Scaffold this active site. Structure first.
Site, mmCIF file in Angstrom:
data_model
loop_
_atom_site.group_PDB
_atom_site.id
_atom_site.type_symbol
_atom_site.label_atom_id
_atom_site.label_comp_id
_atom_site.label_asym_id
_atom_site.label_seq_id
_atom_site.Cartn_x
_atom_site.Cartn_y
_atom_site.Cartn_z
ATOM 1 N N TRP A 168 0.465 -1.462 -0.095
ATOM 2 C CA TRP A 168 0.183 0.109 -0.253
ATOM 3 C C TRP A 168 0.789 1.650 -0.126
ATOM 4 O O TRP A 168 0.247 2.439 0.447
ATOM 5 C CB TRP A 168 -0.952 0.010 1.307
ATOM 6 C CG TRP A 168 -2.045 -1.201 1.838
ATOM 7 C CD1 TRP A 168 -1.933 -2.370 1.517
ATOM 8 C CD2 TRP A 168 -3.365 -0.212 0.598
ATOM 9 N NE1 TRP A 168 -3.339 -2.793 1.742
ATOM 10 C CE2 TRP A 168 -4.271 -1.726 1.282
ATOM 11 C CE3 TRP A 168 -4.198 0.479 0.124
ATOM 12 C CZ2 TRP A 168 -5.764 -1.852 0.989
ATOM 13 C CZ3 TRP A 168 -5.280 0.261 0.190
ATOM 14 C CH2 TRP A 168 -6.559 -0.706 0.578
ATOM 15 N N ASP A 178 -6.539 -7.417 -11.835
ATOM 16 C CA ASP A 178 -6.020 -7.111 -12.776
ATOM 17 C C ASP A 178 -4.763 -8.438 -12.502
ATOM 18 O O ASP A 178 -4.342 -9.248 -12.086
ATOM 19 C CB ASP A 178 -4.556 -6.339 -12.019
ATOM 20 C CG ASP A 178 -3.009 -6.535 -12.887
ATOM 21 O OD1 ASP A 178 -2.973 -6.866 -13.855
ATOM 22 O OD2 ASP A 178 -2.301 -6.163 -11.905
HETATM 23 O O1 LIG Z 1 -6.364 -6.776 -4.747
HETATM 24 C C1 LIG Z 1 -6.078 -6.144 -6.099
HETATM 25 C C2 LIG Z 1 -6.014 -4.458 -6.240
HETATM 26 C C3 LIG Z 1 -5.547 -4.306 -7.026
HETATM 27 N N1 LIG Z 1 -6.316 -4.904 -8.171
HETATM 28 C C4 LIG Z 1 -5.890 -3.652 -9.726
HETATM 29 C C5 LIG Z 1 -7.669 -3.469 -10.019
HETATM 30 C C6 LIG Z 1 -7.191 -2.971 -11.211
HETATM 31 O O2 LIG Z 1 -6.306 -3.171 -12.538
HETATM 32 C C7 LIG Z 1 -6.049 -1.238 -10.529
HETATM 33 C C8 LIG Z 1 -7.757 -0.937 -9.515
HETATM 34 O O3 LIG Z 1 -8.441 -0.001 -10.719
HETATM 35 P P1 LIG Z 1 -9.731 0.375 -9.779
HETATM 36 O O4 LIG Z 1 -10.336 -0.943 -10.453
HETATM 37 O O5 LIG Z 1 -10.165 0.681 -8.547
HETATM 38 O O6 LIG Z 1 -10.096 1.509 -11.043
HETATM 39 O O7 LIG Z 1 -5.698 -2.741 -9.563
HETATM 40 C C9 LIG Z 1 -5.690 -6.446 -7.931
HETATM 41 O O8 LIG Z 1 -6.364 -6.860 -9.480
HETATM 42 N N2 LIG Z 1 -6.609 -7.250 -6.689
#
Ligand SMILES: O=c1ccn([C@H]2C[C@H](O)[C@@H](COP(=O)(O)O)O2)c(=O)[nH]1
Ligand SMILES: NC(=O)C1=CN([C@@H]2O[C@H](COP(=O)(O)OP(=O)(O)OC[C@H]3O[C@@H](n4cnc5c(N)ncnc54)[C@H](OP(=O)(O)O)[C@@H]3O)[C@@H](O)[C@H]2O)C=CC1
Ligand SMILES: NC(=O)C1=CN([C@@H]2O[C@H](COP(=O)(O)OP(=O)(O)OC[C@H]3O[C@@H](n4cnc5c(N)ncnc54)[C@H](OP(=O)(O)O)[C@@H]3O)[C@@H](O)[C@H]2O)C=CC1
Ligand SMILES: O=c1ccn([C@H]2C[C@H](O)[C@@H](COP(=O)(O)O)O2)c(=O)[nH]1
Ligand SMILES: CCc1nc(N)nc(N)c1-c1ccc(Cl)cc1
Ligand SMILES: CCc1nc(N)nc(N)c1-c1ccc(Cl)cc1
Lengths: 544, 546
Positions: free
Chosen positions: B342, B451
């Site tokens: 974070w 992601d």
């Molecule tokens: O635990 C997590 C936290 C974040 N993300 C990724 C998804 C997105 O690419 C980006 C966050 O973007 P938003 O969806 O909030 O816009 O981080 C994950 O895959 N897993």
């Protein structure tokens, strides 16, 4: 058993018949519902690009490698050797005479024409003509074709059906009504049964699907590796003895089940065959599983279950009720929408420990969280204007202003207000996705009554997706249903067993008043369900 | 047209190998490869005592026959030899292996047993078996017997020579994912001669995970069928990014016949997104390929789903998880443990862009931890004591699971609509729902944004661990972890690395061990967790920017 020897099939496309006594709607439905073949020399509907594409793809497709077994079977029968194979298309004079010269003869297809008044010299040498029905049985044992497709018309179909000269019937179901004068014969379910049903589509402003009737019969290395890898699987299903598969003769007799409704039906079957027996909060028993996902293409059809009758006035009003942000149970009861009645009684409220909640005052449920999440709930009559977070308004602005956002989510599960709610929400949330001007929506449901609730839930959020889409000037794409605790109440088993053996009909379509561009402006008359063909109503609780 | 002996007589090899107790310490970074699994036996017997599952597998494979296929096999061997009561398979073993089999199991049931030996002759055996003194005599014997398939079953000397003579059509290889003392090993398999064509689901048996893979010898009613072709007339549209992403780059990925290893649920999703994903701009500007709605299911009772197609560490995510449980929102706590998950989200720059001008650096706001223990309370600052403020969802779900297991209301929700703008950033993991049956706990987690290349791998591990934790303190056994993906995306700059990854073949998953003494979800500490037997491929940098 000659129709099986020469591979004689019949391909057609029937719409629904109109009426002078009552048009646009029917009381009871059955396969005979689809029979319209033609009107005044031509087809009832102008044309149908997809069906056309289907017809072509079928009557011009041949598998040369398969011509073997057919040869090693046709000749042996003929008692004589048959003296770049194609298929054969048999039609009547009228049928042929309706085809335009620009497109006739039918390319890559061995044309044939039944008629008692047509010279063989008036046409080609490639275009064969016959005077009798059996006169075709020969022409075949003499030619080198792959399959024989009877393509009409009414006269032709009739004759071949009665003389048991049809192996299978490729029936296109155009789900819309048109004016007709000629029709297709009533298929006898004792001599013909359905074996496959396709996905549903929309073409030329009408949904349609493709089914297949079959004349009632009454490397290898990888293959073995497949057996090894399944060495630890279970012989039968848990509820094998509880739920007898022989009770699904129809369901299993189907080879291809591409009709979207099977996503729902298959889950019912998976829970009945592999579900876990559990005793829920109602003493009633259930069969449950955890985690499923269904997807419905709203651009091709409206997923309103056809294997039983469903009503929508009530659920639409509930939807309109949510949108207004109401929590007043009386508003719905005064419109005879009793979805929440049992949840607002003095007893239920008291058992929920809401001793200080007026009857029918459901507390901070859906409507309140959608328009006032975070606000302090007082009573169902208070004015909440501009209090709390208006999620609905927010997700709509996000969809319009930042479509690719991954935070377009509408949540009803407000942990803080749960106990103040008559009952916690089953529909936890909606998430939206926007791509190339199309709107998709996922809805997560924590508890799913498969026999009774889910059917409505699907219709409910599909309708909502359309609404959100229209006020955002987008086209609906997919409604995606995620089920958490998915269960089937034991008292629905016999009813679902009956439903599981019913073959779906092409889905209906949803039409919204095009002028409504604000999510808050919809009224009950703005919703219309078109061409809803269904099996008769079923009482989930046979116990009456 | 060069008919190969192993094809004509269908000679296969089936074995099982564990990991070898010989690991140099020079570099605490152990490299892994197929040769990692090579232990065959020790002091005359198997390195591990017994393995029920592999034994069952072995028995099923070596006794299975397809009567309706012999007919064709018989013709094949006849034409080859110029030739024109129940069917069994043949098993061939070295004399030492035969002597290791307990008397009550000699000869192997429902199987034509063949033994290779020079020191012993038929007179030295009482059992119904064939004795041969050289490889060629096997080919001869096979030419005279009626059998389905021939399986070489050991030991090292026997596998060795048969492989060398290229007399093996396929190798059914069992991978025991654990280490034992060994004195005999399986020969190193030459990749030019043999390729893996199928990998199985992963299982746990006798306190160890294992999977089954198949190696293949490298090269160099028809009615229903047509209906199918018909029903696919409109599948005209192939793949939108297929031309953008050449599936020829997935040579290995596409060569596998059966891909049942659970890691493929993840790998298959990446592939689906790459071939059919929609191109879209990102709030980050990077651009992605995306799809909407997926679901993966992992059987935690059979393994811990930590991706093996690349290297992952869990100290951070475990500390993050504990951090959540304590209800902390203070980023400094993690940074002092050198966990920077974070760090970027708590900077002065990041906070200001979230319009959180009155938020102290590293004060992440009312995120997960705060929502799990105090949902509904008004966030003040990260140093505040929120004792008995808000709704302690965590304690609540633990009680529902304990006293009302059949409840369909056991959810832990982090998406607090009201506090969203106060958080450094809204949660990606919306909620967790629990299911309890026959003393077993299952968990569904809905991820709104995923992601695939970076976050998901860690997310799968985070919630799988969490599920083990909840189950233990509730006296239940971990069952399934169900992951639901909302907006699934592959960032454009992750593609090349993901192509590499998709062509790597999964290793059996490792296992997770929790200190059995911890009885409260809050009493866990970093040393109560242990990931065992993690075999993985080389670490990959999803972003190859330098
Ligand atoms: O635990 C997590 C936290 C974040 N993300 C990724 C998804 C997105 O690419 C980006 C966050 O973007 P938003 O969806 O909030 O816009 O981080 C994950 O895959 N897993
Ligand atoms: N939905 C669909 O799949 C199809 C719909 N249609 C529609 O239906 C209508 C045409 O159907 P229909 O009226 O029945 O006309 P038909 O196409 O069936 O042709 C009937 C005529 O063909 C000849 N014929 C048929 N059977 C025999 C036989 N056993 N022996 C000798 N001659 C035979 C005779 O013509 P003759 O005068 O030369 O003696 C007879 O009058 C059109 O409006 C068309 O648009 C047509 C085909 C398919
Ligand atoms: N993990 C696994 O899948 C397996 C493990 N094992 C283990 O491995 C060990 C046994 O392996 P290993 O030591 O190599 O012994 P082997 O089982 O391979 O037997 C070797 C012996 O078999 C005979 N033999 C082999 N090839 C020939 C030939 N071409 N002609 C004539 N005779 C031949 C000879 O016995 P002779 O002395 O009589 O001349 C030779 O000494 C044990 O520890 C056992 O537990 C065994 C099978 C499978
Ligand atoms: O829209 C709805 C509303 C309710 N239910 C069902 C799920 C459960 O069977 C019952 C509610 O009980 P709990 O899940 O809250 O315990 O109602 C649905 O399937 N859909
Ligand atoms: C493309 C329409 C079509 N679809 C199907 N499924 N079956 C058919 N028999 C026809 C058809 C209608 C009129 C003529 Cl003239 C020729 C063929
Ligand atoms: C059941 C163990 C096993 N599993 C596999 N996959 N392969 C094998 N070849 C054996 C095996 C080991 C020793 C003897 Cl003596 C017989 C067979």
């Amino acid at each position: 058993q000659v129709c099986d020897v020469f591979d004689i099939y019949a391909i057609c496309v029937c719409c629904k018949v109109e009426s002078k006594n009552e048009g646009k709607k029917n009381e009871v439905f059955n396969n005979y519902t689809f029979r319209g073949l033609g009107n005044k020399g031509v087809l009832p509907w102008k044309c149908n690009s997809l069906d056309m594409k289907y017809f072509c793809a079928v009557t011009t497709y041949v598998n040369e490698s398969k011509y073997e077994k057919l040869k090693y079977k046709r000749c042996k029968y003929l008692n004589k050797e048959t003296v770049k194979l194609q298929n054969v298309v048999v039609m009547g004079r009228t049928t042929w005479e309706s085809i335009p010269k620009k497109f006739k003869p039918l390319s890559n297809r061995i044309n044939v024409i039944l008629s008692r008044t047509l010279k063989k010299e008036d046409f080609d040498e490639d275009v064969y003509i016959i005077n009798k029905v059996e006169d075709l049985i020969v022409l075949l044992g003499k030619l080198n074709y792959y399959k024989c497709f009877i393509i009409g018309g009414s006269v032709v179909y009739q004759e071949f059906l009665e003389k048991k000269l049809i192996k299978k019937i490729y029936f296109t179901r155009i789900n819309s009504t048109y004016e007709c004068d000629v029709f297709f014969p009533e298929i006898n379910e004792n001599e013909y049964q359905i074996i496959s049903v396709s996905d549903v589509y929309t073409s030329n402003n009408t949904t349609l699907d493709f089914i297949i009737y079959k004349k009632t019969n009454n490397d290898d290395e990888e293959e073995d590796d497949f057996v090894y890898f399944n060495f630890n699987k279970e012989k039968e299903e848990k509820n094998k003895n509880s739920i007898h598969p022989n009770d699904f003769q129809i369901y299993n007799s189907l080879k291809y089940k591409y009709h979207p409704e099977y996503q729902y039906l298959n889950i019912i079957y998976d829970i009945m065959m592999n579900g876990n027996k559990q005793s829920d909060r109602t003493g009633v028993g259930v069969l449950s599983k955890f985690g499923y996902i269904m997807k419905f293409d709203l651009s091709q059809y409206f997923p309103l279950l056809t294997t039983k009758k469903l009503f929508l006035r009530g659920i639409i009003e509930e939807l309109l009720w949510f949108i207004r942000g109401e929590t007043n149970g009386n508003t719905l009861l005064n419109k005879n929408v009793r979805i929440w009645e049992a949840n607002g009684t003095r007893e239920f409220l008291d058992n929920r420990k809401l001793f200080h909640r007026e009857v029918n005052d459901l507390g901070p449920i859906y409507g309140f969280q959608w328009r006032h999440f975070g606000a302090e709930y007082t009573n169902m009559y208070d004015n909440y204007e501009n209090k709390g977070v208006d999620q609905l308004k927010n997700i709509i602005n996000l969809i319009k202003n930042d479509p690719t956002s991954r935070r377009i989510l509408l949540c009803a599960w407000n942990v803080k207000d749960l106990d103040q709610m008559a009952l916690p929400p089953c529909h936890i949330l909606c998430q939206f996705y926007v791509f190339d001007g199309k709107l998709s929506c996922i809805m997560y449901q924590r508890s799913c009554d498969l026999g009774l609730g889910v059917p409505f839930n699907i219709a409910s959020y599909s309708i909502f997706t359309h609404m959100i889409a229209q006020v955002c000037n987008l086209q609906p794409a997919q409604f995606i249903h995620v089920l958490g605790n998915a269960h089937v109440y034991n008292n629905h088993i016999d009813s679902l067993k009956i439903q599981l053996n019913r073959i779906p009909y092409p889905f209906p379509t949803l039409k919204l008043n095009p002028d409504i561009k604000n999510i808050e402006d919809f009224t009950i008359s703005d919703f219309t369900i078109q061409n809803y063909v269904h099996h008769e109503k079923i009482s989930m609780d046979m116990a009456a």
